[PDB]
RNA sequence: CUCUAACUAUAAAAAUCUCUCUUCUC
RNA sequence: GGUGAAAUUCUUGGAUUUAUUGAAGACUAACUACUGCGAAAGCAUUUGCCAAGGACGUUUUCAUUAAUCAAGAACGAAAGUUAGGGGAUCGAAGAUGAUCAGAUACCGUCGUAGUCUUAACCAUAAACUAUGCCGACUAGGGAUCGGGUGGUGUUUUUCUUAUGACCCACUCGGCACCUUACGAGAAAUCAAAGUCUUUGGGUUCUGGGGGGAGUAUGGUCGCAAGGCUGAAACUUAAAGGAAUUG
RNA sequence: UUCGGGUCUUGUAAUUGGAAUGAGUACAAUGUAAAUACCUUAACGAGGAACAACUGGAGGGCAAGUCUGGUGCCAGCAGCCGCGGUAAUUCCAGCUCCAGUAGCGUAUAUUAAAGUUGUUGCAGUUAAAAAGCUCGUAGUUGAACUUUGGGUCUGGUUGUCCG
RNA sequence: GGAUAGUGGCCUACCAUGGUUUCAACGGGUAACGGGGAAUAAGGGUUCGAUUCCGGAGAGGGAGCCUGAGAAACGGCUACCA
């Protein structure tokens, strides 16, 4: 992979999981 | 590996240069890696001067020339044959092609 | 690419710990899974001398040897190319609950 | 900024010697260089050399004879025992048949053999051979 | 030049800076952190007695094809579960599952040797007696 | 031992690839 | 129109061009270079104001006031976020008409946020010269920029001196360049990447096989985007660098 | 002149002798508090001197086999590179041979190797790595210069001529 | 001032606001008793030190104490906890 798009994928994963954190509270 | 000692940019001590659009594909390129040609030409082609010459008022008219630079992205410069893919020891020769006619 | 290669046989019957099985789907990494004619779904590994020499696909009766210590897995040995499979169905060594024809 | 003028002096000496020159211009010219060069000269790596007044820090110009091979300075002037002298001699000098570790002693600037015969030892300065 | 300090009174950093860079060597990091004591079921032990559960065949990697006769085992000393290898030809059928087996290292400092994926350990002693003793017909399994 | 003049004008589409890798000593 | 070819789209309410004007915001073409300024980002119409700085000149002034620097701080491209102002161009999203097997991609037209601003966050970039800063030395050659040197110098022109602009020989500083190795490097190459086994000028900050992974977790800054800090379990005999021949 | 005396030696033989002796027994004595054991010593105690040396290994690393038979990408070996798919110098055996030797073989640690933790002694252009840039406390380091030469006597320690 | 055999916030009363710390305090971990040492070896170092010697600590865990010059003893007591 281009490291750029792997970083983007992990970044979006982080955003989704932190929205999960926010919705859980 | 560093391909060109001059880094193939010709900036070398300026930080950042304004960009200029390519003339064919309009790709923005730094105004120094911006291969550039003086397109000076007679307004009429030499093949058709004679028809103009003997069929015109104002005997011995100036017949001016049109002037403009052309700025290419290097992709266009290579494909449109403006710049060739030279060899190694022949890369460090920067003199233009021996003044095409002299 | 046959120049790189090593370049009417008969069937072989199961012998004391091997069974005819019908592949149900082809799994990745070079594995496969097949129904043995016992009411069981076992996991077969495509053996050497077999990997990229002779191919196999879904719906193909094929010989597989069991491993005496772990029955849940097994390794496939000998393939049957669609005409002695009918013969296998004929001789009745394996139950005829599974007919495969196109 | 310049930190140890002796290092600059010896670096100029080595650079100009390697290129094959015969004279060297030492710029800062402090006591320690003068003593160093007298030790050098009495050993013979250097010919008749010269100091110059400047009303400020002076200057040195030193004649060579190509006799030298390499000089050098151990800039952090390490505390050497009378015992650890052999350690430095082994680690710096080519072969004990010759070579001289130059160190400052309670007597003064002094090569290692003088230090051992006077039975004194101080801080190490450089190494010449 | 040589961008580390060289003054007499710089000793401190020359120590502490090294005290930082030592954290690069994996050996040193394992030794100070004691990762051999939390992970790596051998709590620093070169050998451990476990109970065998089942005998498995494990595939091999690309250039080598063969069914390596490995064996699951749960270690008494911690209760963890690992996979080991039987280091001779006719010795898998010496295990007699649900048996006390003594496990040792496997020749690569807590790694996988050769072409046996997902294993870390040999097998040396089975039912008290050493496995190589059985494979040389010098002693016999008690079968108790 | 005297010098610095020419010049042109192209781009449509074309994806994938199963083994088998093997010595240098007089 | 537009393209490789085409269509979408606008057009006898006359589109396209042909002239005058006027509005808006935009940018400052060509001058534009192996040239300049700045700490770096970056900086290009004119003019005035505001303060600032480099270098050069100095038989001027003080006398170690110096260098790098954990901690702390200021700037910090573009995109982004607030809010208010503007709203041309160009264009993420979306809408389209093509190509293709599919193409919600590359080509083609419209079009939102942005693109420009005004105060505040963001502090990341291949923020690259992939060369930390301050020192001293070492080889030949030219030009070029800034200053200052000397010409019985040239045209300048105001008769003549003065300037300015040039020519020469300089010198100090700056971006750089060419040749070479007699130094290095593993080489590509470097005038520093030399003065390093003949191993010591002063100094900060980084790395210890590759993956796991800049991920897990805890802090910490931020509204948010996210940034700084930062592993391990585990998995492998390679990954990687430069060059050679095909 | 082919010789061949093996004339001088070395080895190789299930040929063949007589020497020598301990491990073991054991009279005793010593040894000890008592004793064992050792140190002595009667008498016993070597012929295949069965009174029997193992442990790993023979592709490379690395000393030693391209010998035989078996298995046939299976079993297995292999710390790494790799061997094995019908002629296996790598498995499994037999025969030879290598290495160490009453020792040798593993496994997890640690040390030298490791100039792969670098203070002596590492790299930072691209192989990992120079903070985006600057200021700045602590830390680190920080220009040169303030009695050097001369004269004497004299103590010795070395090599002189040597007594 | 008390208490100690005796100095001492050692403790009590009344005062004052000081003490240490980026020269790493405080906190956390140590499968750490400290040391004489052992392995290792061009030089420089790295690791280990439960243990033949020296100190210290403890006698299941904590506390309390009599006797005695000497113990907060443990093959000496008291109590709690296991
Ligand atoms: Mg600059
Ligand atoms: Mg160019
Ligand atoms: Mg053929
Ligand atoms: Mg298989
Ligand atoms: Mg397909
Ligand atoms: Mg019109
Ligand atoms: Mg302009
Ligand atoms: Mg300019
Ligand atoms: Mg900071
Ligand atoms: Mg913006
Ligand atoms: Mg479409
Ligand atoms: Mg689109
Ligand atoms: Mg588009
Ligand atoms: Mg548009
Ligand atoms: Mg970054
Ligand atoms: Mg790593
Ligand atoms: Mg990663
Ligand atoms: Mg986090
Ligand atoms: Mg390459
Ligand atoms: Mg024997
Ligand atoms: Mg073997
Ligand atoms: Mg053997
Ligand atoms: Mg060999
Ligand atoms: Mg064979
Ligand atoms: Mg063998
Ligand atoms: Mg060594
Ligand atoms: Mg290294
Ligand atoms: Mg890279
Ligand atoms: Mg890299
Ligand atoms: Mg960088
Ligand atoms: Mg930088
Ligand atoms: Mg300071
Ligand atoms: Mg000084
Ligand atoms: Mg300790
Ligand atoms: Mg200890
Ligand atoms: Mg003791
Ligand atoms: Mg006690
Ligand atoms: Mg107990
Ligand atoms: Mg008494
Ligand atoms: Mg007690
Ligand atoms: Mg007691
Ligand atoms: Mg009692
Ligand atoms: Zn272009």
UniProtKB/TrEMBL annotation, chain B:
Zn(2+) 1 binds at residues 22, 25. One of its GO terms (molecular function) is mRNA binding. One of its GO terms (cellular component) is 90S preribosome. The keyword ATP-binding does not apply. Keywords: Metal-binding, Ribonucleoprotein, Ribosomal protein, Zinc. It comes from the Eukaryota. Zn(2+) 2 binds at residues 22, 25, 73, 76. Mg(2+) 3 binds at residue 33. PANTHER family: 40S RIBOSOMAL PROTEIN S26 (PTHR12538). Belongs to the eukaryotic ribosomal protein eS26 family. This is 40S ribosomal protein S26. It comes from Kluyveromyces lactis (strain ATCC 8585 / CBS 2359 / DSM 70799 / NBRC 1267 / NRRL Y-1140 / WM37). The lineage of its organism: Eukaryota, Fungi, Dikarya, Ascomycota, Saccharomycotina.
From TrEMBL, chain E:
Gene3D superfamilies: Nucleic acid-binding proteins. Coiled coil: none annotated. Keywords: Hydroxylation, Ribonucleoprotein, Ribosomal protein. InterPro entries: NA-bd_OB-fold (IPR012340), Ribosomal_uS12 (IPR006032), Ribosomal_uS12_euk/arc (IPR005680). CDD domains: Ribosomal_S23. One of its GO terms (biological process) is translation. SUPFAM superfamilies: Nucleic acid-binding proteins (SSF50249). It holds the Pfam family Ribosom_S12_S23. GO terms for molecular function: structural constituent of ribosome. The keyword Cell membrane does not apply. GO terms for cellular component: small ribosomal subunit. Belongs to the universal ribosomal protein uS12 family. PANTHER family: 30S RIBOSOMAL PROTEIN S12 FAMILY MEMBER. This is KLLA0B11231p.
